[model samples]
Target: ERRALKIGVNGIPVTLEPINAISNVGPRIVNQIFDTLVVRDFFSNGAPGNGINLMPSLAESWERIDDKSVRFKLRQKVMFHDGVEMTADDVAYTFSSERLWGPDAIKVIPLGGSYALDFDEPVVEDKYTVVIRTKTPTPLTESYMASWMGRIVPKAYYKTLGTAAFGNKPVGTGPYKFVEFVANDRVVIEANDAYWGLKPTASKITYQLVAEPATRVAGLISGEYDIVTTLTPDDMALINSYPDLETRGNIVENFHMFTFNMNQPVFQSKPLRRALALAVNRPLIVQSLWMNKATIPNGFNFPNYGKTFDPNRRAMEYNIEEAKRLVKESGYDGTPITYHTMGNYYANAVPALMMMIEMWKQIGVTVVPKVYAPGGAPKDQDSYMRNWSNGQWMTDAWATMICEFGPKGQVQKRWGWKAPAEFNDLCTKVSQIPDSKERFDAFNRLRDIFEEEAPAVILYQPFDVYAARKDVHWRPISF
Candidate 1:
């Protein structure tokens, strides 16, 4: 009998385009249908802090040719879901200038461009060999290859289908083959028997969109779903109460924060930004909303980054008096700042925003809460909630802080946040400098500048909780 695993999620991917599909739930489906050159070795069980350990995927073997170049030997006899042989051409085309970085580059999300900016077009050395060269000395090349935007696509098939068609019906060399994708409904995939790697245990997997948390839980309890994602802390006790169900959660390598649009005239005041940062009681939000299951991160950095992690780094101080003082110093009347957010995309997102709105009120700031559907928020909003992560799976400052806030990063590109020239120079040094101490120093300086400037407010690190039937075994990875 063929087994089908049904997983309920809070949202469905808006698109499956390798570069454009960057929503909260997009990767969850896209990862199953695409294959990357290298993958993180999660050891025996999928645990955190092993992001540096790399294993072969599409590329069977690889060697560092120089400080900026790496050559990979493609796996033999590998086949795409469309029954096409995977080759170096496909790998090269996947990261080509036309597809990623050039003037005529395919339209990609701003975050996708950030990943592409680090590397030039991949050079095809032979039919099955490709050499990837970075613009600078990137120590975490393998980690970047294992991350998002590293997934290889069939060149011939993609050219024939074009961007929109390919994204709608993606064909890749992964454990699963795309069966169907109904927007805001469900995405269905079936086991790829011709997969070069470990075959999937289930014959089919269906990711159904259940926007309401209670609905997802109901489906899980009714045995309609084997697993449910984006479970809130409040639902934990209820989930665990069921004999056949259990809730598992961990503090993933990501942080939730509010990104300020510096282009906005009101946000141009640094004192106002600092006041907004100081007003929020992050620990209280964790207790009230997350039930203290989540953790308050020091800053944008993560501990899994090994040596690059700064233990002494502290997040913004939460002092209502200081915030009030700053608000008065800014010499501004209570102007309403529009806070844009996706209502239920994140667990307790609206409630958290509501809590922050009240906190801002105490500082004489009026926040106008605006709830938009997923991916529908106005680009020029005053401020928006953003959840960013260290997808590179490397112990480097370049992975998180520098990548998002650098000169060419999403902060500047998408949110109109102008980073200081010194900050930009530090970003370059952090990427090029191999010495951990130098990189760490650069990281600290960047953090200092970021804190002082207050382009964004660092919130808490969220613990991703999932409810699953005991029989349906799975392990969660930090990435």
Candidate 2:
């Protein structure tokens, strides 16, 4: 009997609606269901997921005519899932939708990402051609665009349905089209007969949310789910012991950091901030939480990022007495340091935060821990735990740097932070300059500023874990 592959995930994607879903879930499945202008040349022979090479997708080829302009020759005769022909008009609208770039422009990149950052007001020169004009010739324009082009939507169809209805029934030029999406339960997709590319191996894909690790493993062992995500090292061993099952693990380009609210009263003093950094026992955290599988990050840009990462700068040393002295010097009038965290956000989140609490207590400091809803718009918390992705197409530390710690980064906006003028200027200039050396220098300077400012503390980097049946042929999971 033929069977469909079912995927089990730790958390349910809140929505399949591409335009506004802020969580990673939307893109995780959206890429399989929608065709973008360009796509990352993902590795087939077990390589890093963030491949810088670009390949044709909806747009057959792209040329950088000038610093500020890029012209795309779209693949002809592409058909949307709705049986409508996808043209340059659909591509144009996907990038320049009034709804997408309106007052709430922030809504765009959650789905759009680098494409929104690179291109501006696209022009559909013809049915098969589109020209994108950029605000500036940044390094990320063509390279990063490979990964995120804000999955194309049928222009006329989107208007008729409106955002909500469009999300309910999205039309795209992809292998699979949506069949049913039962929020919190499952999302079902079926192969599109008119798909413009290679036919998908599986005709039907069902995504189910299996929040509990034990339950997911049980299902995998019972042959209920063909694939499952986020398994512990011990669980990985358990799954691999069975001859009928297999597991793949890779470190995705995701980093966890504890960012401080510069505006908060408790973290107002620089010495206090440095003290907290010095108190973190990374080795202990790794052993207790990650089972030694995770890397203890010395800087935001790991050594793998090439030219951009700095090696000479010493990582914050764990000094208990120094932290205590700094606390006394700051005259911290017995104020309880508030740390906002969530239980379900990350696998090691609660334990990591709890570990930090105990470590800080060793330095004679008081901490107040509170559970906040993930992405609930935290307010007035001194520090919060968050995750950051390095990049999609390329590991450009400078690029994600501007997006996360930059002047307009989400973290900055959330905490009402403005980078020091020197660092801010360097960040803006890093992209505009064409010289690789100049850009590398700027990145180093940014790293220095990042280390000195202590806006955030880099923690452990975890690997992406997947459990699948032995017969399943799948690539390693990535962001």
Candidate 3:
């Protein structure tokens, strides 16, 4: 009751502008600071699960007349903290400046590979309308805008400072105003008195970066934290640590699976991929590695996440004999499949991978697990996120639809893959569908294809659960 709206996060914000950032840290920071033109419902697959498409922030309703030309209704009532009104000039400036500054923006806008180019001059029609003219009639245009990828920033303010300075000193008209950031420790924010939406409850908010599972649990138990997330499963047992400690139910926002260099050797064959998919004991990982605290995804969905997931879908059982048969039939006489990891993303990935190696050996497949970048620290922020797989990665979804289904989807990046035409085409079609029914159907197409072909075997979705202190009054989001 003494302090309002204090929470704990495992990491600090990489940057202030949400659009330019591309990780969980990015959104965590952005959520504290900004609102979008139209945020998606929790069920919506493309954009962020934040506020709705409000007409007041910057732009309101928008429609397309043709492939290249699109219309956006500007919000007349919106103003930043600095007393600047929302206008077409700000819209144009945001497009040029944010897009130019972001890594994924330019690459996604044309929705294709790059060229020596610039965003077309932002064209305005009257005070309330603005048009986005693209170089092509790209299907992903609307969906792209829906992502953190398209969130806008002030053009004039950003221009005053170069890119380096703007990355730190970002100003926006969100519910929270930036206060001070203690490097590697905390970021402080206070509620914006001029905010247009529901005012934040806290007097001053401090985001603590508690990276360790032990310390995070300790902090929560000791009442050093009012709210903390991404707690280890072992920590869940401490739900009763405090008489008033409340464990908010965990939500499975994303899932993970093994990826392949589809154009290379054994990975080129779907049947072989199916065998690898079947070899791993996913439930064991759910039980042992995740401490029985995670949803054992039959595919990618958990009950808390709702309908899009197939409830009946199941992990291909661990059949060593069948795995041997498939491997032999595929003619892997003795060569070990190269397994690579960076050990930077997941919590228990290393031991889990070792378990996979042991299980696959029982099936007569020699699985060679290797940590590509062991004993290395990130040199810089860019190198850190990009270093997950050494520019080349054997990867899977880490949740946050931003990675797999947003503008940054594997198909958008070609995933260093091209062997599966149907899979590749499915991603293309699903991202562009204008109709909601069609959009849902397209995702169904993706799931069905992955299940049969076993393109990506989603092992389990690890959930981050947290309970508030009994005295703290708050509602939670799935996230």
Candidate 4:
């Protein structure tokens, strides 16, 4: 594993610099060059549940004292990529800077609000004890600390060097360090002698972004890349078509869905939403296109995502008669139902939309599809905000609670949903719970509201498929 490993991936738009955890999807792509406080297991070797084990890194010990405050014990004697010694100051800089989910911290942390860090002046407590005053009753304090968003980073380097230095050249305490970035095409990283934990097996790794799936598959066939992320069903088949190419089991841990601007005329009615849900044949959608590479959504969320998922949780069944009845009841007469879709948004997205359209037609709903190409949608987040903030039409980050119960709410959002504040509040509450069982039940409760009202449908959980050469051993973590 000493030889260099090359990973072929779908393209990212810009440099995934270290200053912003949310930047360019680089925190992940560039992970090879830097180590997080914890990491997913890379050696599980592709069996069901065999991949992805999250383990500790910089901070080796932690505890929750009565739910309000948590303490982390940093490991001593480790050096950073730039030869700086690891200390509480470096860890604090990460907390005070990149990791803290302040109102303005949207540039890094995933969710922007309701989470913030207030760290007291460091006591040092003999070099390893890094104590912080955390806001208790937040329910997510422990989970937040364990999150990749809070990984320890070098403060002095970032402050003195700035983001530009980190982007083109960077330093981290991970098992690897930055070697070279070829700009828009490839980033080459070298092993970090500073890595304090399990020494990484592979010495050097190269990450290259390949925009086209077919092209990526071709690259893998040529042995140009060690791995390719989440194969399309067609790409899966194509790669398997070649004897030299093979696939592995990467965990498909996250979900995917087309959004509805709940505040609009087209998607506002519960009945119409029900019709849209019922008209979807999720199994057929997966089979004809995904070819069993993916699983069906039994409930509103992924089963592996803990209690929020429902195996028996019911969604409206695919009954053409019922869909027509629901749509007609909602006061629609031959109005062309618009289903926005495109490639690169999700694998099998266009095909999934086609299934919905066919089902809608069976129920007498005229379907109009607005299909944008890969890279065709609103490029800027502002554009997406303006287009969706006041409309009943558009897509979004599937089941994002704010869009459900924010100031706009569903009343005039996504085809005009009625007041669902009670249910919305329940979802918000459930999202914050830390324990697995309690949160699961809360998700179940929220999903019950979904089944009853039929506001939106949760589609299959999307996963990245990695096709790699058997000779090279490396980790490709997907969320």
> How would you order the candidates by lDDT, starting with the best?
1, 2, 4, 3
Question: In candidate 4, what are the lDDT values of residues 1-479, reduced to their tens digit?
Answer: 27777777654424445434333235556555555554445455563653344456766776656555666787888888888898887766666534344434434332333223333333345566766554434434444454444555677887676555555667777777777767656777777755787777877777777766677777788878777764665666667777666776442544555445555556555777677667777777767877666765556555434334456665535676777778778887675645655444355565666676677777777766666543465432212111121111001112333334332333233234464676767645654556566666666665666665665566665545668776655564433
Off-target runs (Cα >4 Å) in candidate 1 are: 44-51, 106-109, 379-393, 474-479
TM-score of 2: 0.87
lDDT (C-alpha, whole model) for all candidates = 0.78, 0.70, 0.56, 0.57
Q: What order do you get sorting by TM-score, best first?
A: 1, 2, 4, 3
Q: Candidate 3: what lDDT? A: 0.56
Decide which is better by TM-score, 1 or 3. Answer: 1
Task: Kindly indicate the candidate among 2 and 3 with the higher lDDT.
Answer: 2
Any runs in candidate 2 off by more than 4 Å, and if so which? Answer: 19-24, 44-50, 97-104, 107-115, 159-165, 261-264, 267-272, 303-306, 311-313, 329-338, 368-393, 475-479
- Model 3 is weakest, by summed lDDT over 10 consecutive residues, at 384-393
Question: How many collisions per candidate?
Answer: 0, 0, 6, 21
lDDT of 3 by residue, 1-479 (tens): 43555576655655665544444445666665665555444434454432223233445687877866767887775666566665776666666624552465445333212221124556878866777766645434444454555566666776677444666776776777778766556777777777776666667677777766566667777788887766556666667666888675553455555666554556656666667767877778778867777765555444432333345654545666666778778887676676665542445566677887788777777767655432243332212011121010001121222234333445234433333456557555643445355655555565556655654566666665665688877532224
Cα-based lDDT at residue 232, candidate 1:
82
**lDDT of model 4 at position 25:** 38
